[PDB]
Amino acid sequence: PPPPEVSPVTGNPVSPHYIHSSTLHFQDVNGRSLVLRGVNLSGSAKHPNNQPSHIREGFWETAEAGKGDFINKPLNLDDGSADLHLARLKAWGYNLLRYVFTWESLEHAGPKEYDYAYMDYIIAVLRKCKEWGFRVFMDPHQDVWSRFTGGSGAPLWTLYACGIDPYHLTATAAAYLHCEWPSAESPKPQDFPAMIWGTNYTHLANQTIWTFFFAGKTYAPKCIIDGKNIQDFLQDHFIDAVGELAKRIAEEAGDLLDECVIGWDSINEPGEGLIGCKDLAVIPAEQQLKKGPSPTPIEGMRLGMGEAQDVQAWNFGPMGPYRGSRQTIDPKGVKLWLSKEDDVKRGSGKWGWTRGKEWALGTCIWAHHGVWEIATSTLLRPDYFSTLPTNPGHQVDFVDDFWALHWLAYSSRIRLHHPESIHFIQAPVLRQPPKLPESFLKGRACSSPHFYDGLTLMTKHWNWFNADAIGVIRKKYWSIVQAVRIGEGPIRKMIQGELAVLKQDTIDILGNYPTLVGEIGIPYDMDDKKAYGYVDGGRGEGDYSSQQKAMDCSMNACDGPNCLNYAIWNYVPDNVHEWGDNWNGEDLSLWSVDDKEDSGDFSPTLILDGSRAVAAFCRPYPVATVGIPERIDFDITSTKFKYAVRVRADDIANEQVYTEIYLPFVHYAASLNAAQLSLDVTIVASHGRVEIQGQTLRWWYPVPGTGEEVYTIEVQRNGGALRR
């Protein structure tokens, strides 16, 4: 069966730019299989202007004042720079953008005080993306709940709504903030340990807030606010805020829908809080992220009541976390919990909600629900969060029982304002998605997991070894040593196998839908920033060999038999060598000003200058295919490219319906000296005819008279690889 002429969601006829998301591959209206590849734009939208993660001055004051100046991130629309960035991304062959926005940027002023101006800024950015021919899906983005709890996402007033005093987070170790590390009194942000920001998910603030968000009605029934459980208060305000952006786009720029904005991602990498914790007295060996001081859930609660604790600290070794020394954390009586007087002054009383009388303030909310006894520090219900407190034999599943329920509410709101929206389903990190009902999917969905080469990300080193982290997580190996691989070949094949597992989750669970890797990337600040000239007397500056191999391994993993859609994390216009992406020590931008100095009518400087390891992320691939993509192989050193496609007898092929392949000047240009750029390639196709224009290869062929047959096309630069 070919793609239908009417939407499976509404039954209305579809525009000619409609992308079907009803089978294992995206399809255009003429039946061509589409591959969408691009970048996340942008991590820089995680924080307001002039307040990067490492700067404490102004951090609290602007948010307490209800401000949130995010205008002109990710792209500045006043200085002309916005078109140059989009031109670069398009010239690299990208046709997809995962657009990053935060709840904070929409509702920083207070509950239901929406920043309509930032909404209109986003619309203006989306309009330019459309002019440049991008497809876009929207990412409501967060990391460890909010900037105020170590990352990005929610507005500061959500902390007060949860009864948390933001100024006591550091003293109690309830969250590690980059700008208050190692202490608020004497910050040394440059010493912030690599990737420690992620452990905030397993410290007390995130552990509480996420339990509220997804399951407050089950585990914190006394937490009433505006006559609602905190769970509904938080979820309703988040869904309303995203819903107001969607409504704004639908009412003020409806032309963006479906032609440019094709769908919406669900809440980014949601935290699980304490839900499913089997034993509050221990950190499970299965928890894969441990680094720095790591209080157990009960140790963190005692800390949140101001009691000093001696906590295990963890180092990240070649085979994962291993124990270091124990470290004493002494809050010296400081408590995480808002006092009542502070709630009147800075919380409920200021932001304008009414807190219920059984919501005890200034003391641990989990003790208040009987989890532990403060006087004796006795854990009373170690398994409290593993079952339902009032029907305690039943064991809970975070993804099926709480995440999925939030997703029904979220997805319904999206469709209210965007009737043809593709649901990009992002299950919680490292979990399989739940089975979701067709009454909500309605044949218009796409699985959007994230995948990172975790060893490379955490160690900021391209290692000569690696390990199959997904297979370990999923108990496919009897010992972790049999998950280990050595050498480029075995490592690449193993990572490609990991991406195949995620592809398989989709068809096993959700159905015959596409898969898109919503985030994938590598760190560029490897080797103590040797590529930036920061060590060894400057030796190694500009040499991105290691970043290139790491990048190429992750990108190759989306090729092979996987042939995946994906969005690279990320593209950051204001990335710098000193502070990276300006967020928690991460440096994953493809491009940096510090690295400066269909047409070939632009300069090689656009696609090369400022780029890092461009040879690995700018790659040939089929944008649109008559038939089904079967296999992609690309080798940087030889430039050899081979594409195999399964073509059936009922596929549609003619002079206007053909396969289109992107061939980058980066790999295939005759010359890249800073006079029009032009491809100099040899092409071998098993069937049909081809012609090249600019960076585009067009491939016409007849379908088989019967059955199905694999056609192939091979490309390489005449005379081998360039030197860039």
Helix residue spans in 347-487 (DSSP H): 348-351, 365-368, 404-417, 438-441, 454-459, 469-473
Tell me how crowded residue 673 is: count the other CB atoms within 10 A of its CB. 9
Return phi, psi of residue 145, to 5°: 75, -50
Q: Tokens for 308? A: 């000093």
Asked whether residue 689 is assigned to any structural domain, the reply reads: yes
The technique by which this structure was obtained is X-ray
**Cα–Cα distance, 688 to 583 (Å, whole number):** 50
- CATH code for position 663: 2.60.40
Q: Is 519 a catalytic residue?
A: yes
In sequence order, what are the beta bridge partners of 322? Answer: 315
Asked whether residue 39 is assigned to any structural domain, the reply reads: no
The whole domain housing 636 covers 626-717
Residue 359 exposed, middle or buried by CB count within 10 Å (0-12, 13-18, 19+): middle
Resolution (A): 2.1
Q: Tokens for 383? A: 């398994």
Asked whether residue 235 is assigned to any structural domain, the reply reads: no
User: Are the C-beta atoms of 218 and 189 separated by less than 8 Å?
Assistant: no
What is the DSSP annotation of 324-376? Answer: EEEEEE--TT--SBPPHHHHHHHSHHHHT--B-TTS--SS-HHHHTTSEETTT
User: Are the C-beta atoms of 434 and 289 separated by less than 8 Å?
Assistant: no
**Cα–Cα distance, 194 to 646 (Å, whole number):** 44
Asked whether residue 426 is assigned to any structural domain, the reply reads: no
Question: Residues 269, 272, 307, 586: which is the catalytic one?
Answer: 269
Return phi, psi of residue 13, to 5°: -65, 155
Asked whether residue 643 is assigned to any structural domain, the reply reads: yes
Question: Residues 104, 420, 519, 586: which is the catalytic one?
Answer: 519
Asked whether residue 704 is assigned to any structural domain, the reply reads: yes
Residues 6+ apart with CB under 8 A from 117: 71
Asked whether residue 383 is assigned to any structural domain, the reply reads: no
What is the DSSP annotation of 229-264? Answer: EHHHHHHHHHHHHHHHHHHHHHHH-GGGBTTTEEEE
Listed in order, strand segments (DSSP E) in 543-651 are: 565-568, 621-625, 628-634, 641-648
Question: Regarding beta strands 516-520 and 565-568, do their DSSP bridges make them parallel or antiparallel, or are they unpaired?
Answer: parallel
**Cα–Cα distance, 48 to 104 (Å, whole number):** 9
What is the DSSP annotation of 678-689? Answer: -B-EEEEESSSE
Distances (CA, A) of 189 to 62, 168, 313, 576, 645: 20, 18, 19, 15, 50
Helix residue spans in 92-229 (DSSP H): 103-107, 116-131, 157-161, 204-219
Return phi, psi of residue 505, to 5°: -50, -35
Asked whether residue 489 is assigned to any structural domain, the reply reads: no
**Cα–Cα distance, 116 to 64 (Å, whole number):** 19
**Cα–Cα distance, 117 to 114 (Å, whole number):** 9
**Cα–Cα distance, 705 to 420 (Å, whole number):** 36
Q: First CA to last CA across the chain, in angstroms?
A: 46
Distances (CA, A) of 662 to 4, 295, 401: 27, 50, 43
Question: How many folded domains does the chain comprise?
Answer: 1
Q: Which residue has the tokens 């989750």?
A: 505
Distinct helix (H) and strand (E) counts, the chain: 20, 29
Residue 304: which region, alpha, beta or left (left: phi > 0; alpha: psi -120 to 50)?
Answer: alpha
**Cα–Cα distance, 556 to 565 (Å, whole number):** 12
Name the residue type at position 476.
K
**Cα–Cα distance, 266 to 406 (Å, whole number):** 10
**Cα–Cα distance, 261 to 603 (Å, whole number):** 30
Q: Is 286 a catalytic residue?
A: no
